[PDB]
Design a protein around this nucleic acid. Structure first.
Ligand SMILES: [Mg+2]
Ligand SMILES: [Mg+2]
Ligand SMILES: [Mg+2]
Ligand SMILES: [Mg+2]
Ligand SMILES: [Mg+2]
Ligand SMILES: [Mg+2]
Ligand SMILES: [Mg+2]
Ligand SMILES: [Mg+2]
Ligand SMILES: [Mg+2]
Ligand SMILES: [Mg+2]
Ligand SMILES: [Mg+2]
Ligand SMILES: [Mg+2]
Ligand SMILES: [Mg+2]
Ligand SMILES: [Mg+2]
Ligand SMILES: [Mg+2]
Ligand SMILES: [Mg+2]
Ligand SMILES: [Mg+2]
Ligand SMILES: [Zn+2]
Lengths: 90, 51, 154, 120, 134, 93
RNA sequence: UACCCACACAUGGGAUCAAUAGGAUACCAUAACGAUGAAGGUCGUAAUAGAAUACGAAAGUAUUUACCUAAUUAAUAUAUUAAUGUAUUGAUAACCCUUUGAACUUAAGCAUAUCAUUAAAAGGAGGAAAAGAAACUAACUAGGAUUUCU
RNA sequence: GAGGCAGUAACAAUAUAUGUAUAGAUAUAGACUAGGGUUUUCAAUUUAUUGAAGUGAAUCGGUGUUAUAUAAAA
């Protein structure tokens, strides 16, 4: 049958983790992520308008860009050992 | 199923740790006097999707 | 903290007791408690024990569509009767607690009478069921509040 | 507690013996947590002592590197000691290179300089 | 308008967010108190922030007139407790009262943790402001 | 390979403490073995070399384990008799 | 006893009114990424720790920065003598320059036409970009590189 | 958010005067893989809630070779 009698036969799993995005959308036979398209260098364009909200620039941790913005507003504190050395460069 | 890879075990250990009620030493504080956890799950109701 | 609808003229010699949101069906405890008012407290505990051992019946008056006839309901000039178990055990626990406060305040047990008996509805507790062709229907239950006051005779 | 001033006093060889003796102190404290009682602020002061001690060591090796590469051009020194601004600025050409001009232009403007004059 | 932004604004909600989410030295200066007249002759400024253990006197409110020493300071609530004052609870009246430090004037100081160094630094900076004007 | 290096790996970095369970106490007396808790990233060869540096007693074989709570435990056999009772007494267990 | 009406007192539910560390629109300034390892992810660190939040074995308050990731003991090219040095690769969701390019719809039907030098898609840079010093406009008593407004 | 129909349809209901036992009744049972992930064991309070403990490999699986320019837990 098509209904209740055939849902017992579903015990095979096809998608696994991806290395780059972290979602469970990496096909193990086609060898390609269905969300980020992993083995290619460039990332995939998302499917809808709401999909650009979910992982944009700024919902993360921003380990580096938090620093770069902070030197724009306030000046950078310098190391005095490094400051004396750069004046001795030719 | 007693035959796991490395990634499946490391993800499964972390998912066991996060299913816990609030400890009793924190509940005596004024902040958490009546507050309780809402993100608990049951092992028979909802599945974890780890594969 | 349900308030009573009883108007107390004398603060002494009036004993109150209360259970809030008891896990008994509402339509069955209403049927048992309709004939407890204007009775002695000793006659009530003897009467409710006969309902558990099926020797006296309860006359169904308000919610009575589909009840079997019996001969034990001739004492009330009626023709319908039933013997609910779990509703009678919940009312028996209330009447024992009134008897204990009377001996603590030193009152006389025989002189007491039942004066104010009312019950009312309570908020629900929801449930679930799974029917044919994959549809889901509610399966909830309905508790009640129980309020009883006792007064000495003159 | 320990001050950051006392670590700057000592020698390089004397700095290393402290880090091991501080690391031995954390071992006996952690065993006390399992088999006994531990005061509610005792481990945290011991962990922050080693973080202050390692930071003086990283500064003392760095001043040795500056004396070795003191007077050289920029392509001789390692890339970590180079000054960093951003990637788009390192590829920009200098102020001296941008203002150089052809001999037909700078010879002409030297003959007719600027004049300061008054109202109309 | 994140937290502790210290703005020049006239809206009701923008100014009140700076009162709740202030931190640092800005939280200290909200809890200041008025000087006595004889203390004003010694130094010359108007007010100064409040520390623990100096003798104060209430000048307004239902507790008017009483004088006591400071027992606690609560930075998260902008409240203090003064000796000799009682407040009713559901069991007793032994609870000390909680007051805002804008209703109190202090009479005698308390010199701890370099307190004399700070007071003499303000008295130097005040008179230089007067010499700029003339 | 870098200019300024990290310091050397010291045996206080690998061993954390000594387990004090009921199953660990049976392994001390009847079989002269020590039950330690180590860090997760180190292998079998470096664990056995560290134990003979700390307590000064030779260790022969080490069986490791990763339990369900995320730790890593080691079962360290000792060569000479009476070592494990002496070590656990001086360490305070 | 049940059915109906009137009055007084108690249950059930969250409408009305008042407040508010939240949003919406317009204007002004800025227009700072990445092989010196970015954006994003996985796992760990609290004296008694779950969610949230901050942080990397120096880990729950001026340096360090675990493992994947353009992810690189490489690839396409240049210079010196198989080795060494130099330059490019990834992110964008507004404005700018090229390539490719529809149909729904209107014509009261429809096939040239319109929607349209548009939407989607691809390539390339900057705080702006593109354009710019007549192998022009005019028929007057003649004007004078580009851009923007009426 | 809460009614009528309505406590109506539809489902569950072994014996002993003293018992950690004497009897009755229904159902074949046990191991590897795919899937599940602490349900395991014990203690305390009433198929629940909280807290501890528990998985040890030179010879048992993977990591190795290939199926005529990415393939095997038989
Ligand atoms: Mg199949
Ligand atoms: Mg397939
Ligand atoms: Mg499996
Ligand atoms: Mg299921
Ligand atoms: Mg019937
Ligand atoms: Mg059914
Ligand atoms: Mg179904
Ligand atoms: Mg092993
Ligand atoms: Mg249209
Ligand atoms: Mg048409
Ligand atoms: Mg039409
Ligand atoms: Mg048509
Ligand atoms: Mg066209
Ligand atoms: Mg411009
Ligand atoms: Mg240009
Ligand atoms: Mg049946
Ligand atoms: Mg359990
Ligand atoms: Zn992916």
């Amino acid at each position: 049958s098509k209904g209740t009698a055939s849902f017992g036969k579903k015990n095979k799993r096809n998608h696994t983790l991806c290395k780059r995005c972290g979602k469970m959308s990496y096909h193990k036979q086609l060898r390609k992520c269905a969300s980020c398209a992993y083995p290619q260098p460039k990332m995939r364009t998302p499917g809808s308008i709401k999909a650009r909200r979910r992982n944009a620039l700024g919902t993360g941790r921003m380990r580096h860009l938090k620093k770069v913005i902070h030197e724009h507003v306030h000046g950078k504190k310098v190391n005095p050992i490094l400051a004396a050395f750069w004046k001795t460069i030719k | 199923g007693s035959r796991k890879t490395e990634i499946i075990k490391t993800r499964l250990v972390r998912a066991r740790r996060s299913n816990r009620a609030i400890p009793a030493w924190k509940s005596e504080l004024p902040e958490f006097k009546d507050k309780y956890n809402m993100k608990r799950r049951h092992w028979r109701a909802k599945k974890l999707k780890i594969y | 903290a349900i308030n009573f609808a009883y108007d107390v003229v004398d603060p002494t010699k009036v004993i109150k007791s209360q259970i809030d949101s008891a896990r008994v069906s509402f339509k069955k405890t209403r049927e048992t408690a309709n004939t407890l008012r204007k009775r002695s407290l000793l006659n009530a505990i003897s009467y409710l024990n006969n309902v558990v051992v099926k020797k006296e019946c309860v006359p169904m008056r308000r919610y009575a569509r589909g009840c079997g006839h019996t001969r034990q309901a001739r004492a009330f000039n009626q023709r319908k009767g039933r013997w609910p178990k779990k509703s009678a055990l919940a009312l028996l626990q209330v009447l024992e607690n009134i008897k204990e406060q009377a001996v603590e305040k030193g009152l006389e047990v025989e002189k007491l009478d039942l004066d104010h008996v009312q019950i009312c509805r309570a908020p629900k507790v929801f449930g679930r069921i799974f029917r044919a062709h994959g549809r889901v229907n509610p399966f909830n239950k309905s508790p009640c509040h129980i309020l009883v006051a006792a007064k000495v005779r003159d | 507690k320990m001050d950051c001033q006392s670590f700057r006093e000592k020698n390089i060889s004397e700095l290393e013996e402290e880090i091991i003796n501080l690391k031995n102190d954390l071992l006996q404290l952690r065993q006390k947590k399992v088999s006994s009682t531990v005061e509610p602020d005792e481990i945290k002061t011991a962990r922050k002592n080693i973080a202050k001690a390692l930071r003086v060591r990283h500064e003392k090796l760095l001043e040795e590197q500056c004396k070795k590469y003191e007077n050289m051009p920029l392509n001789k020194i390692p890339k970590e000691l180079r000054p960093k601004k951003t990637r788009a600025e390192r590829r920009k050409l200098t102020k001296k290179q941008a203002n150089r001009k052809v001999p037909k232009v700078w010879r002409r403007e030297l003959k007719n300089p600027k004049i300061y004059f008054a109202y109309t | 308008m994140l937290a502790g932004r210290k703005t020049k604004s006239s809206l009701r909600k923008k100014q009140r967010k700076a009162l709740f989410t202030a931190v640092g030295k800005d939280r200290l200066k909200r809890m200041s108190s008025h000087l006595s007249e004889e203390l004003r002759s010694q130094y010359g400024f108007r007010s100064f922030p409040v520390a623990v253990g100096d003798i104060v006197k209430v000048h307004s409110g239902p507790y008017k007139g009483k004088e006591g020493q400071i027992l606690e300071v609560f930075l998260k609530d902008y409240r203090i407790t003064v000796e000799g004052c009682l407040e009713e609870n559901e069991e007793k009246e032994n609870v000390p009262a909680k007051l805002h430090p804008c209703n109190v004037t202090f009479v005698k100081f308390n010199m701890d943790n370099g307190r004399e160094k700070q007071l003499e630094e303000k008295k130097i900076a005040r008179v230089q402001h007067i010499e700029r004007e003339q | 390979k870098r200019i300024i290096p990290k310091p050397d790996i010291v045996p206080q970095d690998i061993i954390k403490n000594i387990h004090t369970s009921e199953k660990a106490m049976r392994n001390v007396e009847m079989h002269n073995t020590l039950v330690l808790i180590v860090d997760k990233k180190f292998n079998k060869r470096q664990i056995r070399n560290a134990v003979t540096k700390l307590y000064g007693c030779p260790c022969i074989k080490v069986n490791t384990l990763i339990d369900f709570k995320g730790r890593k435990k080691a079962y360290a056999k000792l060569k000479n008799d009476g070592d494990a009772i002496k070590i656990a007494g001086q360490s305070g267990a």
